[PDB]
Design a protein around this motif. Structure first.
Motif, PDB file in Angstrom:
ATOM      1  N   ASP A   7       0.835  -1.191   0.000  1.00  0.00           N
ATOM      2  CA  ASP A   7       0.000   0.000   0.000  1.00  0.00           C
ATOM      3  C   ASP A   7       0.875   1.248   0.000  1.00  0.00           C
ATOM      4  O   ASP A   7       1.940   1.279   0.621  1.00  0.00           O
ATOM      5  CB  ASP A   7      -0.926  -0.002   1.215  1.00  0.00           C
ATOM      6  N   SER A   9      -0.838   4.718  -0.249  1.00  0.00           N
ATOM      7  CA  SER A   9      -1.606   5.910   0.078  1.00  0.00           C
ATOM      8  C   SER A   9      -1.500   6.206   1.573  1.00  0.00           C
ATOM      9  O   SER A   9      -0.660   5.651   2.287  1.00  0.00           O
ATOM     10  CB  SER A   9      -3.056   5.741  -0.368  1.00  0.00           C
TER      11      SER A   9
ATOM     12  N   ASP B  17      -7.694   6.359  -7.926  1.00  0.00           N
ATOM     13  CA  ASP B  17      -6.817   6.046  -6.811  1.00  0.00           C
ATOM     14  C   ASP B  17      -7.216   6.905  -5.617  1.00  0.00           C
ATOM     15  O   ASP B  17      -7.436   8.110  -5.777  1.00  0.00           O
ATOM     16  CB  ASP B  17      -5.360   6.292  -7.184  1.00  0.00           C
ATOM     17  N   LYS B  19      -5.541   8.104  -3.113  1.00  0.00           N
ATOM     18  CA  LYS B  19      -4.602   9.197  -2.892  1.00  0.00           C
ATOM     19  C   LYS B  19      -4.623  10.179  -4.056  1.00  0.00           C
ATOM     20  O   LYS B  19      -4.511  11.393  -3.855  1.00  0.00           O
ATOM     21  CB  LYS B  19      -3.196   8.638  -2.681  1.00  0.00           C
TER      22      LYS B  19
END
Lengths: 48, 48
Positions: A7, A9, B17, B19
């Motif tokens: 991951d 983010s 996404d 983010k």
């Protein structure tokens, strides 16, 4: 761990790891000079 | 329950996404059939 590090983010392992270093939001999020909030030698180090 | 539209999970065709950055395919929007014996290599559809 594999999933967390893959991951990227705000939930990623990279962000929480980088809390303790660069990039710097310390002391204030906005400042002309930035350091790390790894409080060393302070009286709040165990708390942090 | 009195319905009005499709559930949000199957709405977006290309999921963003969280983010920010490169988008990703949304299977819940649609899938693709890629059989060669019947030579059908095309995505499906939702004719609501």
């Amino acid at each position: 761990l594999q999933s967390l590090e893959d991951d990227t983010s705000i939930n990623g392992f990279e962000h929480i790891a980088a809390f303790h270093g660069q990039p710097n939001w310390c002391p204030s999020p906005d400042a002309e000079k930035k350091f790390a909030c790894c409080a060393h030698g302070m009286a709040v180090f165990p708390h942090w | 329950k009195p319905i009005t539209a499709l559930p949000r999970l199957v709405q977006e065709p290309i999921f963003k996404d969280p983010k920010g950055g490169l988008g990703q395919k949304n299977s819940w929007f649609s899938g693709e059939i890629n059989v060669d014996s019947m030579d059908v290599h095309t995505s499906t559809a939702r004719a609501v």
